[PDB]
Design a protein around this nucleic acid. Structure first.
Ligand SMILES: [Ag+]
Ligand SMILES: [Ag+]
Lengths: 130, 130
DNA sequence: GACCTTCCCCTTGCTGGAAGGTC
DNA sequence: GACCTTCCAGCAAGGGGAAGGTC
């Protein structure tokens, strides 16, 4: 298969695919006498994994490490679980963080008469003036 | 005041401050016969607002627009509230999104015996193979 | 005109570095 | 020696469109 073929089956863009290849994150596909990248089923799996890892919040470096595990048949299914559970934690800390913001913001907008007067305790609050 | 002074009072770095200035986001401070930026209280407010808007999830463009409002005394305290309430929504959509991920991930790690065997239904699941 | 390739710039929100001019 | 001023370079994670192959 060629790249646009793989693109559409995986939901990745072409540029994305080249980019992962460039970054050492996936196995390079063979070229053809014309240089067109030429993919096999394996590459498909690698890329799909990559994309699916991304959608579920792994970053590239980590998505890559998941791919290095896909390619090790002596892997421990545990070293993944661990990885996967950190990512849950991290996702958890990040949700805490956004709630604090939700909170801080909601406080500010209660106090705002939002009435077309120009005193705006949001602004006043956001800058330490007054 | 000079930049490091303003830096430390606001919690911004110097490079950050120059950068906001460069980007049109804050008022430029006067220079001195030697070119050192030289800040007034106003600039302090502007930058503090900027930083505080950022910590509570506004991006630069939006933080900037809040600053353009701080500098308009004919502003409506309402045009802010609106802005502030969008940012809550957006923060809300973003939390939905991270929960879906938490979910998807948690599913995957239940099923993983995490036992040092090499079948890893996480991987298997993440790539459409098997 | 339909893809394929490499090339580097645009982004967002900064942070670090190295030259040079003050303090 | 530690301030400041400028620009060079780059992190994620790719996008945009050049300039060319070649079927
Ligand atoms: Ag208000
Ligand atoms: Ag597993």
């Amino acid at each position: 298969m060629n790249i646009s073929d793989v693109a559409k089956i995986t939901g990745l863009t072409s540029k994305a695919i080249r980019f992962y290849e460039e970054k050492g994150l996936v196995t390079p596909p063979m070229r053809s006498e014309n240089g067109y990248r030429t993919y096999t089923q394996q590459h498909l799996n690698e890329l799909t994994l990559l994309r699916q890892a991304r959608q579920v919040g792994f970053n590239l470096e980590e998505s890559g490490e998941l791919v290095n595990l896909f390619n090790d048949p002596q892997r421990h299914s545990a070293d993944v679980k661990r990885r996967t559970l950190e990512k849950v934690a991290e996702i958890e800390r990040h949700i805490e963080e956004l709630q604090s913001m939700r909170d801080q913001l909601l406080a500010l907008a209660n106090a705002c008469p939002g009435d077309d007067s120009a005193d705006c305790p949001i602004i006043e609050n956001l800058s330490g003036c007054c």
